[PDB]
């Protein structure tokens, strides 16, 4: 009986693949061929952030381009000003191995987690002045891969157990648990409309989930290795994702097919972080080959090489105002480029 | 240069001094990893040599040297994605129960997968064959490994197999048990020889 259901599901998947292949009438290379190129964006090191003591793992930008949060493998969540290099706060975490960190749009709460299976959300506007533990979201069964602030009270959080959960800062319970995947979740990305989001897994899979409905509407499996980086397009109808095979791909939730592929034979080092600009023209990807290579979202050409680092690039983040890009690697250096 | 900006700069300098003081203790301690299957004897090691929560940390001081060992007890058996978080650590300690011949093949398989990892190409791994007394009482193996029928001790089969599967960073095969008391000193000597070799390869003195 199970064989019939399995072959029927396989036939449905084949029909979906044929439908996605037949609707493609013209590729993006032929459409973006008569457009003007971007040239070479040679960025330089504007600020130098050497405040951390161990390897930096992740970072995230907020609404204001001044503050910037960063996490390291020691357990010191450092929030500092990107303008005058001033360190605003240094939160001593209960653990050391951190894998992700976020910054709320209102700047009132910050998140951090990792292999601890517990998300520690702290407060910044505390009347006591010091940083006190505000919420301890517990209940996961896997290492925390990526987490972001959807709202000042509710936020989605992924884990290493192939499942994601929508937690509340005030309640602290799973109000919506998404369907488990076939591979460990590695990264996620919220949409600007705050209605849906996307999340990548380890078994070359990407799922688009909704906030209200816990069912995935878009599924992408056009990869050949484990996905380690994924970012959402600011327009709200596309998103780029990167794997360990040094092949980045831009998918669209409207067409449900590949739009652009960024890869070269000279680079065989996978990427760990991807992010678009304020408009979406340039795509900055954090390569592990002691440097980074930016690409064009339309022409899929190398628009510049940033070789200001000397270790594996851990994370890369573009601010909301599009004025600076913070790249953190394992050399305890979170360098700012413009 | 306003007064508020100068006060912020002073606060940043104080935070930097605090981070330096923390980095002092961070570099004074040695961060170790602990790995092993479900049938491994890591529980006896962390219970006796002590001198949901997906990761457990054991901080112990011996011979005026502090060691912080991180072990996984409530995580998945896959060691592909989260294994990169433990890069550039001092050393890894793998535990294996030599008395269980059935799960010995899977133990060797996972040990080979961990040793041949791309992110662990310069991290030393120390193998601990627990349940030595149980293995001695049991032997007093050919169906699982026929090479034991042809292998002879040099003028040691498990150690030879571990060396062959490792050399196929240097491994340190040792033998431990549930009643051993000098295991802490052995781990100390191993983690000291590893640091000495690292200093020799950094100073170009190898």
């Amino acid at each position: 009986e199970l064989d019939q259901l399995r072959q029927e599901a396989e036939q449905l998947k084949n029909q979906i693949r044929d439908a996605r292949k037949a609707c493609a009438d013209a590729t993006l290379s032929q459409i973006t061929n008569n457009i003007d190129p971007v040239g070479r964006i040679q960025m330089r090191t504007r600020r130098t952030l050497r405040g951390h003591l161990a390897k930096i793992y992740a970072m995230h930008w907020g609404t204001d381009s001044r503050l910037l949060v960063s996490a390291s493998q020691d357990g010191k969540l450092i929030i500092w000003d990107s303008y005058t290099t001033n360190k605003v706060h240094a939160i001593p975490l209960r653990s050391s191995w951190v894998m992700t960190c976020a910054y709320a749009p209102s700047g009132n709460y910050v998140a951090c987690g990792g292999l601890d299976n517990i998300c520690s959300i702290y407060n910044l506007k505390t009347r006591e002045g010091n940083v006190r533990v505000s919420r301890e979201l517990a209940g996961h069964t896997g290492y925390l891969s990526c987490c972001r602030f959807l709202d000042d009270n509710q936020i989605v959080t992924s884990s290493g157990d192939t499942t994601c959960a929508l937690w509340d800062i005030e309640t602290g319970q799973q109000t919506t648990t998404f369907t488990g995947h076939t591979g460990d979740v590695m990264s996620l990305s919220l949409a600007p409309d705050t209605r849906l989001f996307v999340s990548g897994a380890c078994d070359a899979s990407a799922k688009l989930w909704d906030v209200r409905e816990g069912m995935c509407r878009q599924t992408f499996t056009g990869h050949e290795s484990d996905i380690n980086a994924i970012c959402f397009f600011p327009n709200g109808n596309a998103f780029a994702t990167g794997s360990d095979d040094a092949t980045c791909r831009l998918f669209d939730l409207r067409a449900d097919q590949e739009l652009m592929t960024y890869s070269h034979d000279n680079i065989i080092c996978g990427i760990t972080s991807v992010s678009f600009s304020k408009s979406g023209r340039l795509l900055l990807a954090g390569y592990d080959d002691f440097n980074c290579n930016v690409w064009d979202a339309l022409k899929a050409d190398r628009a510049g090489v940033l070789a200001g680092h000397d270790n594996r690039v851990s994370c890369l983040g573009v601010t909301d105002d599009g004025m600076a890009v913070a790249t953190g690697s394992w050399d305890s250096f979170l360098k700012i480029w413009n | 240069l306003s007064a508020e900006d100068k006060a912020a700069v002073e606060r940043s300098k104080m935070i930097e001094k605090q981070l330096q003081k923390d980095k002092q203790v961070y570099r004074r301690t040695l961060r170790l990893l602990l790995l092993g299957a479900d049938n491994s004897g890591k529980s006896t090691i962390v219970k006796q040599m002590r001198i949901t929560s997906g990761i457990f940390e054991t901080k112990f001081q011996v011979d005026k040297v502090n060691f912080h060992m991180f072990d996984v007890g409530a995580q998945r058996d896959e060691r592909r994605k989260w294994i990169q978080c433990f890069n550039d650590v001092t050393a890894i300690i793998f535990v294996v129960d030599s008395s269980d011949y059935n799960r010995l093949q899977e133990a060797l398989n996972d040990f080979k997968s961990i040793w041949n990892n791309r992110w662990l190409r310069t991290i030393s791994v120390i193998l601990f064959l627990n349940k030595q007394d149980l293995l001695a009482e049991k032997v007093l193996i050919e169906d699982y490994f026929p090479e034991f029928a042809r292998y002879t001790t040099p003028e040691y089969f498990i150690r030879k197999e571990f060396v062959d599967i490792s050399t196929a960073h240097i491994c340190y095969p040792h033998f431990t048990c549930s009643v051993d008391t000098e295991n802490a000193r052995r781990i100390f000597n191993d983690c000291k020889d590893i640091i000495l070799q690292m200093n020799l390869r950094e100073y170009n003195l190898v």
Partner: single-chain antibody
Framework: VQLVESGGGLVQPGGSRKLSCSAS????????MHWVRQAPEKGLEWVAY????????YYADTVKGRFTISRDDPKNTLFLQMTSLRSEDTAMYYC??????????????WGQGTTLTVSADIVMTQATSSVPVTPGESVSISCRSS???????????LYWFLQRPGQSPQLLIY???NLASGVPDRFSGSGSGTAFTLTISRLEAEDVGVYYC?????????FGAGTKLEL
């Protein structure tokens, strides 16, 4: 949260005292403590300023040499010693916590203090002192300064306060464009680098009082005369 001050009383001219402000409810080592003198029927007067870690300490040029401020982190207590008490040192002392960072809340809470009886400079002269208006309408107080306190960074250094009879002053605005916490949204600040305007649309019987002000551009802090509502 709880700042208990002690060391007050009637002292002969030329003596010495040790004002002690025990703090409880916040990180005393992180906040920078300050002192403010309020003479009878007079405004505030800055005396000392110490940051976190006791790195640099600033004293008022009018009382420099006689005052000595010192904090203790193990006990988390502030002490202030003074010698050669003159006829002008007799005033009510207020010891005040403040933290400095991007978008901070300096001079957030003011201690209860204790009375004590004995026996370029920013001259922020207000445009109008007494504006007697019954509660229930919308008003706007206007003030000016002798020097433009608008630095090149773009943050207007201006601290609006409000001291009702009986209770310590309370902070209203951070930098003339960001309201404080625990305060109603009726108060708003605007103006240019020279002139400042504090407008409130709904007046109540509780928010009435004297609206003080100060500058934070240079190191020597000079508390202005404030909105002294006479009659």
């Amino acid at each position: 949260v709880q700042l208990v001050e002690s060391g007050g009383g009637l002292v002969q001219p030329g003596g010495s005292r040790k004002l002690s402000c025990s703090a409880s409810g916040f990180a005393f080592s992180s906040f920078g403590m300050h002192w403010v003198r309020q003479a009878p029927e007079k405004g505030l007067e800055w005396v000392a300023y110490i940051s976190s870690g006791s790195g640099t300490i600033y004293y008022a040029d009018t009382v420099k040499g006689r005052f000595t401020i010192s904090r203790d982190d193990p006990k988390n207590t502030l002490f202030l010693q003074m010698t050669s008490l003159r006829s002008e040192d007799t005033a009510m002392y207020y010891c005040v916590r403040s933290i400095y960072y991007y978008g901070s809340s300096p001079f957030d809470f003011w201690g209860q203090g204790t009375t004590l009886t004995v026996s370029a400079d920013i001259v922020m002269t207000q445009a109008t002192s007494s504006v007697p208006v019954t509660p229930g309408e919308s008003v706007s107080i206007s003030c000016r300064s002798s020097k433009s306190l608008l630095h090149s960074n773009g943050n207007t250094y201006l601290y609006w306060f409000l001291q009702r009879p009986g209770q310590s002053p309370q902070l209203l605005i951070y930098r003339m464009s960001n309201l404080a916490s625990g305060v109603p949204d009726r108060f708003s600040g605007s103006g240019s680098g020279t002139a400042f305007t504090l407008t409130i649309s709904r007046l109540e019987a509780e928010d009435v009082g004297v609206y003080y002000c100060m500058q934070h551009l240079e190191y020597p802090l000079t508390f202005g005369a404030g909105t002294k509502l006479e009659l």
